[PDB]
RNA sequence: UACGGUGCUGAAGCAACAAAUGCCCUGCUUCCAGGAAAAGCCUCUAAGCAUCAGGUAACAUCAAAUCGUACCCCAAACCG
RNA sequence: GCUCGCCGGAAGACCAAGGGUUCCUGUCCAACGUUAAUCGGGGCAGGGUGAGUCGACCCCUAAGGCGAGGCCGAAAGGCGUAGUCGAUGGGAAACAGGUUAAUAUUCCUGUACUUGGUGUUACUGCGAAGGGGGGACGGAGAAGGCUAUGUUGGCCGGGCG
RNA sequence: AGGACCGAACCGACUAAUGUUGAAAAAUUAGCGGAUGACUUGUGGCUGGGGGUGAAAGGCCAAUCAAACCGGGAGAUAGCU
RNA sequence: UAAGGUGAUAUGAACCGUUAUAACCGGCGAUUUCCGAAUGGGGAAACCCAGUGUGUUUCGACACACUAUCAUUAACUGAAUCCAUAGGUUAAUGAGGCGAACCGGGGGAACUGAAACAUCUAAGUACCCCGAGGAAAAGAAAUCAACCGAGAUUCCCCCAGUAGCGGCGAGCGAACGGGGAGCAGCCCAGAGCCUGAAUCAGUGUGUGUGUUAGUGGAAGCGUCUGGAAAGGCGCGCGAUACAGGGUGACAGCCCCGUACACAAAAAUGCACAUGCUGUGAGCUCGAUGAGUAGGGCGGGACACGUGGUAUCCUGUCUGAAUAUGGGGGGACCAUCCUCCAAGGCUAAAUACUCCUGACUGACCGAUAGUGAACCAGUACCGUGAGGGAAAGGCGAAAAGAAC
């Protein structure tokens, strides 16, 4: 049947991406803990 | 810095034929050294396109490390160690045992 | 003074040298391998000074690179960009 | 935000203690009220958010003193 | 010091830069895709070369 | 002919009837629950400029860059 | 290759999302494929995606988002004007035939069309976050005129079962 | 004209049988209701946790809901096993 | 510095080089696409689209620089409204962002314990936010003490689980005083004699010492077993080196090194007889920090829960004396003693480790030690924040098995 997941890359990027973490101070925060546990990827956005 | 260079006349130390004197070839950087009629390993090599393109058993030698062999003094005929001294930066190499130049 | 040739290294590979690019020689058109950033107005430059050739048009595409790399370790090869030059009058090839 | 202006007057937080001595935090908040103070060597109004306590200093030390006082803080009026 | 580049000191360094880069970068780039057999050093050579000229310009701007 | 596919040539190529949920139709009639905005476009002026600029028409020429383009096309390539 | 069966308002064909090389050619069959596999959407190389007209970009907005100043808030921050973004909506222009193993409104052949710049000639009052027009709009129902399209006949080539 | 009637697409889910280590972490096959509207669907957006939203069921808020998930307090505490 | 190099998996090809010029190391410069504080505007990061100024007798157009915002300052302008003011433009300077811990401030839980629970505790902890510095904070007595005196702050050891606080339960818990580390005090509330007078900053090429390249560096041979001696045996040698690692087994004398001695074009950090500039010594007299102390109300901090409760802080309302003075000595009064709030700066002793270098370990040795010895915050899961693995070893040398 219809499952949670149903993918847009326009929501993706407006919800997840780096521009949305980048416009709030929490989400900022987010991007440092990736970036000081190591992630290749600190978006998914990419 | 080098004690072996790269044409020396080297007497084996240690490690298979000791007796054995041979001239370097060449010089590899990880502290071996390949010497002529020295380390003789028998290498089955397959027939390929190009380069060893015959094959068969092929007699080539093998890497000895420099540690395990000692300059030949042509004065006295045992292996004698090597120094350097000389007051510029082409330090010369000196035989002891002799304190001569090499 | 001489115009702007230093930005003329767009070209890169003489040919993709490929069937597709063989029969479109035999029709009117070299298939050549250029930059990633040149436009089709350097592509034109390049080729009328670089060669002899006065030249009609150029089509540009984009190869996406393919991944070619096996399960363990994964890679992509680079993009690049092919240019199909039209050259109906003056062909030297 | 609730600042006197003047004497730099800030919410406190403190504690509204019950007759059980139960302990539920609150803000003492200042007496701010928005007043319009004539500036007779300016010959102008200003506009002020200022406290009663600030209002008291104001008659007490002259209102040009307390603006020159904001002009040293860097405060704009 | 390992190499000399009094030979580069000297003005107008643009038709050394042209030479170096066009025609010369670009036929071993034609003829290293086409395959020829000498190209593998001599790329390296001319993109050093084309290096040594730059830098060279830029100590030197009004060459 | 390895069956792919090439070179050449190529007859007729009309009429009647029935036809949509598609077009006329952003129409017409009727109803009440009363049916976005801004730009492109047209037109008129203000500041300004007056043999200028600008506008219109014709002709001629030049330019239209960059990115996607294979494939799956309600599914063995999407979500499961 | 010859029969048989199944779908045929799809189990046929095409756009969008989404995937990302799964497309094409050659070679291989260890692993994957609920079996074997010579086969494959599997491994490995090599090809392939050609645009002024198709989308994006772009010009303009909607819900909404951000929002200099500003108002407010213990700090973070909340809201909001000018404005600035945001299609799912409104703005220029291409169709037939052929083509490759793989691309086609892109390549080729034929016939087009649009929007700017510049030059020439001719004529002339032109000119803006300004005004107006315009874009510009609902539901249901009913003809009528057609067309896509089909049948039948005429014509043409073949058959004489 | 009709929150009109019969009925496909479409939306839903009334009964039965199968499945229940399934083909499926609610489906299949026969029947069933609505089907011009309080209808349905695509694309964006808005509402955030003792809060939202609810033609109200403790329903729903990513297979999680009488207070989601993730990290921290945290090695909470556990007269219990 | 060098006889060898073009990083590794990863060989091959094509080459470069003989110490006097190939690689390698170190100092200094050049270039440094795009995104990212992102800074020309926008954006769904790594993309879309501009403006201004400089360069087609090449009528395709390209290259370069600047243009975000905020604060301070100056300029030029400039409304309602006359003078003004708000605003607008230009120029300069600074700020953005990141970072493991330490430090200061603004807020601030609950599980839990009391064998329930509400005062209390947990705890000003966890967390969030702001700010700063290599340290931060504090700091120069309106302090303690007791008729003796000590003499700024900060950290350690006692006092001492003491005195007290407390549903006087749970539990919280000092100070006086003594021993140590380290030990500078100053300046403005203002005028006359002095304007690098001694400091303090900026600022130097000077001198010394370090750091970032390096150089030299001693002394072993016969014989036995073995595939191989570093081991066994015999005879020696160096030792300011017998730290360590490697070499075909266990090497002081085989190789790197090691004790020891030396070296730095250049760039820097410290210290100083020091090279320049500006503030600023000291004398004399005058001042002695008011919406402040205090009080009322409500709260917070002091070990102190409002109690008999001194001290400190202020949200609200009040409100002095002003050196004849005022504060403190734990309700309060008298006496006596001590000290001058309502203005600031101040080094060391103290805290911490993202990072660098050496050394050390009765620390671990591949289910251990970091999650990660290994191409690991990768694979993989989830929309996302987030979670998150398994996986070392041929041999001395590939001699990696021609036929």
């Known amino acids: ?46 | 810095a080098a004690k072996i260079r790269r044409d020396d006349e080297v007497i084996v130390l240690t490690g298979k034929d000791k007796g054995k004197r041979g001239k370097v070839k060449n010089v590899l950087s990880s502290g071996k050294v390949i010497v002529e009629g020295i380390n003789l390993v028998k290498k089955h090599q397959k027939p390929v396109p190009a380069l060893n393109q015959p094959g068969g058993i092929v007699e080539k030698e093998a890497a000895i490390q420099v540690s395990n062999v000692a300059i030949f003094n042509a004065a006295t005929g045992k292996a004698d160690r090597v120094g350097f001294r000389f007051e510029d930066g082409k330090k010369v190499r000196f035989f002891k045992s002799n304190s001569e130049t090499i | 003074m001489i115009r702007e040739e230093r930005l003329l290294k767009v070209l890169r590979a003489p040919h993709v040298s490929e069937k597709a690019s063989t029969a479109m020689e035999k029709s009117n058109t070299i298939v050549l391998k250029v930059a990633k950033d040149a436009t089709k107005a350097e592509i034109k430059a390049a080729v009328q000074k670089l060669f002899e050739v006065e030249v009609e048009v150029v089509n540009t595409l984009v190869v996406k690179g393919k991944v070619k790399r096996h399960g363990q370790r994964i890679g992509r090869r680079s993009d690049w960009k092919k240019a199909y030059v039209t050259l109906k009058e003056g062909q030297n090839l | 935000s609730r600042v006197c202006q003047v004497t730099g007057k800030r919410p406190v937080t403190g504690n509204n203690r019950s007759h059980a001595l139960n302990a539920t935090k609150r803000r003492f908040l200042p007496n701010l009220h928005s007043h319009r103070f004539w500036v007779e060597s300016e010959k102008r109004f200003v506009t002020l958010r200022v406290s009663a306590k600030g209002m008291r200093v104001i008659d007490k030390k002259g209102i040009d003193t307390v603006l020159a006082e904001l002009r040293a803080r860097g405060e704009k009026y | 010091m390992k190499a000399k580049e009094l030979r580069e000191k000297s003005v107008e360094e643009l038709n050394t830069e042209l030479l170096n880069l066009l025609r010369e970068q670009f036929n071993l780039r034609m003829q290293a895709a086409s395959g020829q057999l000498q190209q593998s050093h001599l790329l390296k050579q001319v993109r050093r070369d084309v290096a040594r000229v730059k830098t060279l310009l830029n100590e030197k701007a009004g060459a």
């Open chain 1, 1 to 46: 049947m219809k499952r949670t997941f149903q993918p847009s890359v326009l929501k993706r990027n407006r919800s997840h991406g780096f521009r949305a973490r980048m416009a709030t101070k929490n989400g900022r925060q987010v991007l440092a803990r990736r970036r000081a546990k190591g992630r290749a990827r600190l978006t998914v956005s990419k």
